[PDB]
């Protein structure tokens, strides 16, 4: 029972949630939901989206 971290939001992914995405170049990503999945496929930078963990770490919100 391993718990993953979202590749866009950094949130905690529990066993029965989200989707996994394997690229042709061999990299595997995990997505908490389709909101994070769509932002990643839009090439959006998580450091610029307010509600991600990466943004809050960069802005020192915690």
């Amino acid at each position: 029972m391993k718990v993953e971290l979202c590749s866009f939001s950094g949130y905690k992914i529990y066993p029965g949630h989200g989707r996994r995405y394997a690229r042709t170049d061999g990299k595997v990503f995990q997505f908490l939901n389709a909101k994070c999945e769509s932002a990643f496929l839009s090439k959006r930078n998580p450091r610029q989206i307010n509600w991600t963990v990466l943004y809050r770490r960069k802005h020192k919100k915690g």
């Binding site: 989707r19 996994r20 995405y21 690229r23 042709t24």
Partner: peptide
């Protein structure tokens, strides 16, 4: 060997490929 349609592995993982 690869597909874009997501499918459910047991242990509840939905996986799809880029092509």
């Amino acid at each position: 060997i690869r597909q874009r349609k997501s499918y459910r592995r047991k242990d509840g993982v939905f996986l799809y490929f880029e092509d």
